[PDB]
Design goal:
PDB class: dna binding protein/agonist
Strand order of the largest sheet: 1-2-3
Radius of gyration: 19 Å
Largest sheet: 3 strands, antiparallel
Structural class: mainly alpha
Number of domains: 1
Bound molecules: the ligand CC(C)(O)CN1C(=O)[C@H](F)C[C@H]1C(=O)N1CC[C@@]2(S(=O)(=O)c3ccc(F)cc3)c3ccc(C(F)(C(F)(F)F)C(F)(F)F)cc3CC[C@@H]12
Family: Belongs to the nuclear hormone receptor family. NR1 subfamily.
Subcellular location: Nucleus
Protein name: Nuclear receptor ROR-gamma
Distance between the termini: 30 Å
Helix content: 55-70%
Organism: Homo sapiens
Shape: globular
Length: 253
């Protein structure tokens, strides 16, 4: 199945689907690099309440996930799978896709991320009280920066990150396995054509993405235990759905 032109068609279809669904153009993020939060501004974020910062972040993470749900809906063959499989893949892989995606909004020269209109270092998120999770995130973005990814590579890689046939709870495991193989051929083929297979060995292990997601849910349980009515009243429904319905309505569209 899938000949060389069908694989080359898949590549362009995945790359188009990601351009249509990335929250901000790479050019937009790159042009902002010199707009860094002032010392005073960082202190403002630091002085903010924990539950306020946590609301802000859950909100931003939900917007990011919403674009990943649209990227999945535009992925070739994803809408063909059953809703159970669609929701299983999105539940496990949505945070994961964002964790890879975020490298575009990171600056390895000054070690800063683009948050709320400006760039800022780790200390911006001090009030969250995650520390190990924030460092883990910042190291993960630093590690993907060393790869000097192209948009096409980030699109092909994230499609694979999402289309994982090993996710527990999949009903048609073979149907995921068929598409995951096709997407893998497209990724490797593109790498091969562009003389970029070198990156394959440097890519993060699957267990790195799993640890970051675990750290996320673990730190969320802790916060929720201290502030249950903040998570109840001020957290977005889709956030509580994936990390604590909406996905079915989001898929219908
Ligand atoms: C500018 C733009 C589009 O928002 C940048 N982005 C992209 O390009 C990505 F695809 C998605 C988006 C993006 O970077 N992101 C979407 C929200 C944001 S962020 O920008 O708010 C942020 C960046 C770095 C960082 F250390 C902390 C927060 C976010 C929010 C919360 C968490 C947490 F895991 C936390 F770290 F706080 F513990 C959670 F959920 F538990 F709260 C993690 C992340 C990492 C991805 C980040």
């Amino acid at each position: 199945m899938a000949s060389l032109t069908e694989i080359e068609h898949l590549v362009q279809s995945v790359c188009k689907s990601y351009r249509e669904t990335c929250q901000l153009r790479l050019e937009d993020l790159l042009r902002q690099r010199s707009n860094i939060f002032s010392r005073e501004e960082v202190t403002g974020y630091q002085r903010k309440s924990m539950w306020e910062m946590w609301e802000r972040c859950a909100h931003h993470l939900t917007e990011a996930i919403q674009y990943v749900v649209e990227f999945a809906k535009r992925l070739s063959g994803f809408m063909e799978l059953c809703q159970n499989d669609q929701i299983v893949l999105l539940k496990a892989g949505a945070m994961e896709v964002v964790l890879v995606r975020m490298c575009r909004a990171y600056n390895a020269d000054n070690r800063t991320v683009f948050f709320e209109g400006k760039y800022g270092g780790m200390e911006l998120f001090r009030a969250l009280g995650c520390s190990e999770l924030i460092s883990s995130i910042f190291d993960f973005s630093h590690s993907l920066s060393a790869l000097h990814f192209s948009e096409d590579e980030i699109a092909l890689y994230t499609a694979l990150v999402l289309i994982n046939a090993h996710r527990p709870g999949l009903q048609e495991k073979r149907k995921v396995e068929q598409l995951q193989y096709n997407l893998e051929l497209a990724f490797h083929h593109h790498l091969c054509k562009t003389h970029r297979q070198s990156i394959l060995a440097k890519l993060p292990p699957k267990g790195k993405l799993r640890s970051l997601c675990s750290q996320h849910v673990e730190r969320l349980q802790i916060f929720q235990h201290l502030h249950p009515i903040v998570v109840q009243a001020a957290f977005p429904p889709l956030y509580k759905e994936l990390f604590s319905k909406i996905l079915h309505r989001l898929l219908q569209e």
